[PDB]
Design a protein around this ligand. Structure first.
Ligand code: CA
Ligand code: K
Lengths: 192, 62, 209, 147, 126, 91, 393, 315, 109, 29, 116
């Protein structure tokens, strides 16, 4: 009769999520649907090699597609054709070269999209696979939502901390009023 | 020093001149066909509707 | 027309004292964006003068930690409120200002008598609250300088309580370098985003830097 | 400064086979405990097995810690801090990425309840109380040793 | 003397201008720089969890009140809590540097002096 | 602590079944209560894995904790190599 | 196009031609409230009348009927969406702020409130009553029903009913003559389009008065429900409350009949289908009896059994709250039923998917408030895999 | 009176030494050791090296003084159909603690069998063992059961070594109330009780509305009775630390008895606030953070983030 | 938009700098005179030389003194002194504290 | 010691440097 | 107490103590709470009545009835769930208004003045 172990679930890892993401891309071919601990351990040794290939692919894609086509991904409000031929045709029609059109495109980019676009910074070199990962894939890095809801932990960062809540003891009486209430100490009026 | 200055000169260049999240699509009465289409596209509030571009005729009055 | 162009791709006015502006500079040959980015980063953060209150002078209070009858805030609360207001001025030197008013009511930045050199940025900034009709007059010193005021004793004057002024008007700055993907001379795209306290727009701070 | 070595939560790399070894140790401990209730083994035999099977597992995890770091993540920030000899040793790292093992009551005896979790995984309430014996012993013996 | 709540005591040796302190990918310079070597020798990983969760709380505008020994619910409960909140901060505020899938809790920060990044990502937080 | 010396655990380096002649070893009960074999010769055990056989030599005076034809996972203790405070145990 | 017409003539039709979006829609019908546990019975060992900080002691040592309390159908709809399903709520609210707030509460939870009607001339959750002193005892009579209990049959959203593969309602609607008439029309429409009828009893305070009286009221709605969820206390009350109490109090005089009886564990009695015969009918596809989150006794025409569960309100003593746990287990059932049709005729998969409902109920007991802490699907799935051995999931 | 934490933790100290006690001479290190009877009564972490190591302990949060001068710690009794059981929380003296099978594990394990036969670590006869749930007599349910106040203010304490948590309690007793305090983003939820019990915040002893509030006093009216609560402004503590109370109730707001009116120094919104939240990077920086050195920016200086007021009395 | 003072308003330094840059570029590459690409760089280089020279001249010559020790009488002030504002500390001025007699306390809202 | 260790921690070798089996700049000073 | 203020203002009443209160002349709106100590939501509700009682010191009388003690009385009062209140108007001709669930505190005070 199988025994409950608390180790029956494989630990969520960064390697497993990336390895599964690379499996569907075709960059890697795993033995089965789920990456084994041997494959995840092997992934750590060669993790940098696969990241560089994705980075090289993006540089090759940028070289071929062009600045307009490549960076249009982070400008949603840009509906014009971003192809190399379209950009050249637009320059012939209007005289605005590729750089002028490129500045025009980024004029419509929102600040939220710009921060996302910073993953393409030549210094940061963020992983192209990580930039386009869906939320459902990201959660598997730590293994989905916590069983204990975080809403229990959440507290607004402006709270007077009501001391009459269910988790607080009864209000502490003033010491020279609990004694007076229990008639242990007579008031000065009684004394005089 | 000159190469550094030539880098920050362009910043001084000038160019020549030529002369209601709290309201949802559920509340406003909509046809079920339109309602399902919007719901499939995660258009829950009205702001999601205006961010994508006889639907408008019924909507404009409310 | 210029081969190397710059433009303000986004300007925002989040609040009266928080202006955001993002700027692009393209195309830059490889290594120029890195050089421009860091130099602009350091110039914006610590090479732009700002003007703000340096010291305030009351009349009838013994010290900056007492309480004034009719005012809902302590004197130390007033100094922090004064330290928070934002002023703009293109001229140097120490200048005088006055808050000679009477209550009851709310004392705001709009109630400060300013010299023509300086201008108020956010007139709605709270300073003090007057609950009873008292006559409050405060003498102010306005100075334009770099960095932040020295946090050392300089109150040898006629009870002019010093104010730890922070002259830097650029709240934050950032820059990003993106490959132009030219493939012939390795051109690059430089982005610069500037946050200012409203004493000068981010475009002005870009030029001033 | 330029390289800027820095450790994160996932930098505390654990041996891949820890889950298997701990699960195997639990199965042996559970089976033996069941037969101890049946009367097929006596209390001392259970006591020795509990101490030894968890000590051997802890030592094996410590033994395999360096080859795993060398073969898989040579530039792991936690590995480089200890392997280079800059700060910390294998034992202290083992407390972070292995298992704290068995502590000792202030009489020299071994506490039969092991600490299967490390500091990254976090100790349970009972495991943390047990680990307070080692902390109390360490601080007290430090005063004795120095004096 | 400055110290956290995890026994990470510290003396202040240097005060630097904001323009040469290392800064994040949003341009904000860090306020204090700690030695990472303190954690492995002293073995107090709680500050690593608190650091990352503090950054998430400030961006999400939340305050967390966590009873000790949250691992009784599940394995790696604190890790699951911190990473999930980091991703929420990285998503609602659109700051991808807050949660890096390659190395969660860490980010590439830039040298405030030379402006070039440190190649190894650094754990940041509040 | 309990073996009174230096004890080394021979762990299985490969998955598979263990083949050895149980008559060459003497039955015994370990200090943990588990039945096992005591090896007094240079016994060689065979682990028939998925790929090939993985003959392992067991030195004498070492407890053999496994049985013939038994399947053993990798990194599982096979044998213990065995090359005085008195404590009262209240129950 | 007439909701009040007989669901036997021309349907409401409209322009639905494309396939409905998965997962299948679920309709939760009845009043909308926050909290408001309906199942109320007399319980012993009360805590301090004023010091509510002691009342947590009755959360981790609860009355047996309040082990996994149910709530309004809105809680089931809200909990169902957080489990990944799609739920639409049908009901009426007032035009005041509370009606807007309640609708806003469900809207933020991605619950389709297109079936929610607004009564401008009414106050939400407000029942006007007249106090009368009859036979020396003060009583009250409902002068005007609240808008929750005032949904006319002509206000039903047939678009919701046609799409909704499962129709859910409580026995609270049976306490309102207006809603009881409206309910049968909605059930009739739902059966016409092929939707299943879900009956979560959650007997309110008046319905616990008498077994014979209650069964007469439930009789009509019980016979037209394909799926019925009851608690152990509800099921025993409907059959014989005293008989099953005597069995629990029975102890053999001389020796136990088996070794397990010596342990004197909690009585997790599994009612035989013969004892369920009085409450069984032809259309009943599935009956579940919930002893809180501890046991889920399931009954089908072909088979029956019990799914073992747990509860650990003591793992977080200061944030434990039984409220909404019954809603979570019900929502967990509908979440899997709409996605695993094989459940009704495969016992092995029925137990596996019911463990999801068990895990959902366990999480719902770990947070104060019902809608505040309804578990997510991933949170529920993770707890199911942690609690149960991998052979059971 | 260094900070609100020190005012509270000081009154919950245990002194093994003293008149008739075991002083530093008769200080055999056995008394300086953790005993299994200390669980839930004396904090194992809080050694609190004062006069000598392990001779000045502290009481656990839920610890109580019994009738016969004994330390009692509450436990949840697992009554097996034994009456209504009324209150299942039992305060156990150390004598009877040893004779109960107390378990701290959870009940979230299930198998093809039943839950009652699931094993769980437990303490019995000053010994830890793994036993099935049906043999367990008591449960320790409270999170802050075995710890003192100092160790209970450490988030993620289970990820720190116990010895570091010992010093962390010492350091939090040296924290300085700042000029403007700030609540911690990450905490444990005990800062509420610490602020509540410290008496540093102003707590309404009577219910009613707020008629008038200012920097110096708060006027509260209820049951046709008015109370003029005085506030504390720039008052020196015994350790040369400013104690300043700021009103946190606006005019016209209704207050229940026991709720907060004003919060003192190092207290914000009814919570203990001994520090600040600041951006931090864990990297070596040119040796200015060598070992335990800390490199800070000028923002902490000109921003008055760590500026504190200190009042010195010359008499 | 280079800094210009009344002493350098004629922009003569830019004229000298521009031709100097033109001569510098043409002499080093005499065979690229009829080259469009080189002329674009030459003209741009001349502009930068003219800008620098005018910028240098403003710092060298400074500004004439404001209106409220030198062999060749020439009084000049630096850019900082030209941007220095009057303190406005006149006792009769509205920006300076006055005795209680003439305070004229403004009324608030 | 960490900084010196990083300096002398040379190139990645073998399978850690190339994805596939093979089956660099020259500096005069 | 004379020297120590009572911590709780909402007074618990029996079924009979409530009856004579209704039969007797009341000059202020009467708020009757039905609750049970074992009821989860009633913990959150009970705090609001204490807060509400502070707002209405003598302009409205707030009392509570435990349904464990008066289960049959609450059943006759048409009480269907536990978090249930009854606002009894001082005017006998008016109709008592019953609210069910954790109604917002803002609604509670609105009912006191608008409908009473
Ligand atoms: Ca139910
Ligand atoms: K709940």
């Amino acid at each position: 009769k199988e025994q409950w172990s608390r180790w029956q679930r494989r630990r969520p890892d960064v390697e497993t999520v990336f390895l599964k993401a690379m499996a569907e891309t075709g960059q890697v071919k795993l033995y089965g649907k789920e990456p084994t601990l041997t494959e995840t351990s092997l992934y750590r040794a060669r993790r940098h090699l696969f990241k560089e290939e994705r980075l090289q692919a993006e540089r090759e894609r940028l070289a071929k597609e062009g600045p307009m086509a490549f960076y249009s991904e982070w400008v949603k409000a840009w509906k014009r054709d971003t192809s190399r031929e379209a950009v050249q045709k637009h320059f012939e029609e209007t005289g605005e070269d590729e750089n002028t059109q490129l500045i025009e495109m980024f004029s419509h980019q929102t600040d939220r999209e710009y921060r996302i676009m910073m993953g393409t910074d030549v210094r940061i070199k963020r992983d192209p696979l990580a930039m386009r990962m869906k939320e459902d894939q990201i959660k598997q890095i730590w293994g989905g939502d916590p069983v204990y809801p975080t809403i229990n932990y959440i507290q607004a960062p402006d709270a007077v901390m009501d001391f009459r809540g269910p988790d607080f003891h009864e209000p502490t009486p003033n010491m020279l009023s609990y004694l007076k209430e229990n008639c242990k100490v007579i008031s000065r009026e009684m004394h005089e | 020093s000159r190469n550094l200055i030539n880098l920050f000169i362009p910043f001084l260049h000038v160019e020549e001149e030529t002369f209601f999240q709290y309201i949802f699509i559920d509340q406003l009465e909509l046809p079920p066909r339109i309602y399902n289409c919007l719901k499939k596209s995660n258009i829950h509030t009205l702001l999601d509707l205006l961010n994508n571009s006889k639907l408008l005729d019924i909507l404009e009055k409310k | 027309t210029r081969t190397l162009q710059w433009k303000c791709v986004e300007s925002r006015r989040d609040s009266k004292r928080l202006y955001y502006g993002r700027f692009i500079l393209s195309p830059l040959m490889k290594g120029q964006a890195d050089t421009i980015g860091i130099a602009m980063r350091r110039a914006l953060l610590g090479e732009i003068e700002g003007t703000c209150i340096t010291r305030a002078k009351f009349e009838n209070i013994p010290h900056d930690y007492s309480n004034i009858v009719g005012i809902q805030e302590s004197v130390h609360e007033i100094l922090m409120n004064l330290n928070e207001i934002v002023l703009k001025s293109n001229l140097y030197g120490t200048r005088n200002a006055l808050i000679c008013v009477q209550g009851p009511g709310y004392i705001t930045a709009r109630d400060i008598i300013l010299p023509p050199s300086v201008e108020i940025v956010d007139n709605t900034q709270h300073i003090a609250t007057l609950t009873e009709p008292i006559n409050l007059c405060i003498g102010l010193k306005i100075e334009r300088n770099r960095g932040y005021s020295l946090k050392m004793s300089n109150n040898f004057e006629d009870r002019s309580y010093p104010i730890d002024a922070v002259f830097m008007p650029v709240q934050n700055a950032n820059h990003s370098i993106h490959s132009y993907g030219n493939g012939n001379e390795k051109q690059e795209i430089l982005f610069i985003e500037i946050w200012t306290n409203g004493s000068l727009t981010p475009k002005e701070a870009l030029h001033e830097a | 400064t330029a390289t800027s070595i820095s450790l994160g939560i996932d930098d505390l790399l654990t041996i891949p086979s820890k889950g298997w070894l701990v699960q195997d140790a639990e199965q042996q401990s559970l089976i033996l405990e069941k037969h101890h209730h049946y009367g097929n083994v006596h209390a001392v035999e259970k006591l020795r097995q509990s101490i030894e099977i968890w000590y051997a597992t802890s030592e094996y995890l410590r033994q395999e810690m360096n080859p795993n770091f060398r073969m898989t993540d040579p530039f792991n920030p936690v590995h480089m801090m200890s392997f280079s000899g800059a700060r910390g040793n294998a034992s202290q790292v083992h407390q972070l990425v292995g298992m704290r093992g068995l502590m000792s009551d202030p009489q020299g005896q071994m506490i039969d309840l092991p600490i299967q979790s490390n500091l990254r995984e976090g100790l349970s309430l009972t495991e943390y109380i047990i680990s307070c014996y080692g902390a109390r012993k360490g601080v007290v013996d430090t005063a004795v040793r120095t004096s | 003397k400055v110290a956290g709540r995890h026994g990470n005591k510290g003396i202040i040796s240097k005060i630097l201008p904001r323009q040469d302190m290392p800064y994040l990918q949003d341009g904000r310079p860090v306020d204090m720089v700690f030695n990472p070597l303190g954690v492995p020798s002293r073995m107090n990983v709680g500050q690593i969890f608190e650091c990352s969760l503090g950054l998430a709380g400030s961006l999400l505008d939340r305050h967390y009140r966590i009873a000790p020994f949250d691992e009784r619910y599940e394995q790696e409960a604190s890790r699951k809590l911190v990473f999930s909140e980091l991703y929420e901060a990285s998503k609602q505020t659109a700051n991808p540097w807050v949660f890096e899938p390659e190395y969660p809790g860490k980010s590439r920060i830039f040298d405030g002096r030379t402006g070039d990044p440190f190649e190894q990502p650094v754990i940041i937080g509040k | 602590v309990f073996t009174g010396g230096t004890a080394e655990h021979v762990r299985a380096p490969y998955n598979g079944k263990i083949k050895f002649n149980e008559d060459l070893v003497h039955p015994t009960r370990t200090r943990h209560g588990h039945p096992a074999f005591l090896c007094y010769i240079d016994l060689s055990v065979i682990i028939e894995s998925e790929d090939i056989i993985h003959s392992v030599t067991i030195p004498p005076k070492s407890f053999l904790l496994v049985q013939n034809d038994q399947y053993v996972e990798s990194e599982q203790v096979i044998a213990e190599i065995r090359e005085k405070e008195r404590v009262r145990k209240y129950i | 196009t007439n909701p009040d017409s007989d669901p036997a003539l021309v349907d409401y039709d409209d322009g639905i031609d494309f396939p409905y979006d998965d997962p299948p829609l679920v309709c939760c019908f009845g009043a909308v409230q926050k909290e408001f546990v309906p199942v109320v019975r007399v319980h012993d060992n009360p805590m301090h009348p004023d010091i509510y900080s002691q009342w947590k002691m009755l959360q981790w040592d609860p009355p047996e009927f309040g082990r996994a309390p149910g709530g309004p159908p809105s809680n089931v709809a809200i909990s169902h969406v957080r489990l990944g399903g799609r739920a639409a709520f049908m009901g009426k609210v007032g035009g005041d702020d509370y009606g807007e707030e309640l609708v806003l509460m469900m809207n933020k939870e991605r619950v389709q409130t297109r079936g929610v009607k607004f009564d401008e001339g009414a106050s939400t959750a407000c029942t006007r009553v007249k106090i009368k002193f009859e036979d020396g005892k003060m009583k009250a009579e409902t002068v005007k029903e609240p808008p929750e209990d005032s949904l006319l049959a002509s206000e039903l959203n047939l678009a919701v009913l046609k799409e909704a593969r499962i129709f859910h309602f409580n026995s609270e609607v049976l306490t309102s003559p207006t809603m009881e008439s409206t309910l049968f029309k909605a059930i009739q429409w739902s059966k016409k389009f092929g939707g299943l009828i879900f009956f979560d009893l959650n007997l309110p305070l008046p319905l616990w008065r008498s077994r014979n009286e209650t069964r007469k009221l439930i009789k009509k709605s019980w016979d037209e429900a394909n799926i019925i969820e009851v608690s152990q206390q509800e099921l025993e009350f409907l059959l014989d409350e005293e008989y099953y109490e005597r069995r629990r109090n029975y102890t053999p005089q001389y020796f136990a009949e088996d070794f397990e009886q010596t342990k004197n564990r909690r009585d997790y009695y599994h009612y035989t289908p013969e004892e369920i015969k009085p409450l069984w009918h032809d259309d009943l596809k599935l009956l579940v009896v919930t002893d809180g989150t501890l046991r889920l006794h399931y009954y089908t025409p072909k088979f029956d059994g019990v799914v073992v569960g747990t509860e650990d309100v003591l793992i977080t003593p200061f944030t434990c709250d039984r409220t909404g746990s019954g809603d979570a287990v019900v929502a967990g059932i509908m979440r899997k039923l709409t996605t695993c049709p094989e459940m009704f005729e495969d016992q092995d998969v029925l137990e596996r998917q019911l463990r999801f409902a068990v895990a959902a109920g366990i999480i719902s007991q770990w947070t104060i408030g019902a809608v505040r802490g309804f578990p997510t699907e991933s949170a529920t799935q993770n707890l199911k895999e942690q609690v149960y051995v991998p052979s059971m999931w | 009176r260094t900070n609100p934490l020190t005012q509270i933790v000081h009154g919950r100290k245990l002194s093994y030494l003293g008149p008739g006690g075991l002083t530093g001479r008769t200080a055999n290190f056995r008394i300086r050791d953790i005993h299994p009877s200390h669980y839930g009564r004396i904090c194992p972490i809080d050694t609190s090296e004062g006069i000598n190591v392990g001779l000045i302990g502290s009481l656990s949060i839920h610890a109580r003084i019994g009738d016969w001068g004994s330390l009692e710690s509450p436990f949840y009794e697992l009554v097996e159909k034994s009456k209504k059981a009324q209150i299942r929380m039992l305060f156990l003296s150390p004598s009877q603690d040893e004779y109960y099978m107390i378990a701290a594990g959870n009940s979230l394990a299930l198998n093809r069998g039943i839950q009652e036969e699931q094993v769980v670590p437990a303490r019995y006869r000053q010994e830890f063992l793994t036993i099935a749930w049906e043999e367990v007599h008591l449960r320790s349910i409270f999170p802050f059961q075995y710890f003192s106040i100092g160790a209970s203010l450490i988030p993620f304490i289970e990820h720190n070594d116990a010895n570091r948590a010992l010093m962390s309690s010492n350091m939090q007793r040296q924290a300085v109330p700042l000029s403007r305090s700030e609540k911690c983003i990450v905490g444990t939820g005990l800062e509420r009780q610490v602020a509540l019990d410290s008496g540093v915040p102003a707590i309404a002893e009577h219910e009613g509305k707020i008629l008038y509030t200012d920097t110096e006093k708060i006027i509260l009216s209820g049951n046709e009775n008015t109370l003029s609560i005085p506030l504390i402004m720039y008052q020196r503590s015994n350790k040369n630390t400013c104690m300043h109370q700021k009103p946190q109730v606006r005019r016209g707001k209704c207050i229940k008895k026991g709720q907060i009116l004003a919060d003192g120094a190092a207290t914000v919104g009814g919570e203990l606030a001994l520090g600040k939240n600041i951006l931090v990077a864990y990297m070596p920086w040119e040796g200015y953070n060598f070992e335990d050195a800390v490199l800070i920016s000028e923002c902490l200086v000109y921003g008055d983030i760590y500026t504190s007021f200190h009042i010195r009395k010359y008499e | 938009d280079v800094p210009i003072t009344p002493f350098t308003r004629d922009m003569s330094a830019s004229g000298d700098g521009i031709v100097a840059g033109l001569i510098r570029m043409l002499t080093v590459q005499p065979d690229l005179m009829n080259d469009k690409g080189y002329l674009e760089r030459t003209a741009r280089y001349a502009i930068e030389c003219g800008v620098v020279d005018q910028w240098l001249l403003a710092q060298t010559r400074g500004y004439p003194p404001k209106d409220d020790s030198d062999p060749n009488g020439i009084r000049s002030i630096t850019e900082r002194e030209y941007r220095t504002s009057k303190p406005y500390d006149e006792p009769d001025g509205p920006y300076v504290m006055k005795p209680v007699e003439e305070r004229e306390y403004r009324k608030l809202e | 010691l960490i900084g010196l260790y990083v300096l002398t921690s040379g190139t990645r070798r073998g399978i850690c440097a190339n994805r596939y089996n093979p089956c660099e700049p020259f500096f005069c000073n | 107490g004379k020297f120590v203020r009572e911590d709780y203002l909402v007074r618990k009443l029996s079924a009979q103590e409530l009856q004579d209160l209704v039969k007797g002349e009341r000059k202020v709106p009467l708020i009757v709470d039905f609750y049970a100590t074992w009821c989860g939501p009633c913990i959150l509700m009970a705090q609001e009545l204490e807060m509400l009682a502070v707002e209405y010191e003598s302009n409205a009388m707030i009392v509570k009835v435990d349904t464990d003690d008066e289960y049959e009385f609450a059943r006759d009062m048409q009480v269907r769930g536990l978090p249930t209140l009854f606002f009894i108007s001082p005017d006998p001709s008016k109709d008592a208004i019953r609210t069910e669930g954790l109604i917002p505190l803002q609604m509670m005070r609105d009912i006191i003045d608008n409908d009473m």
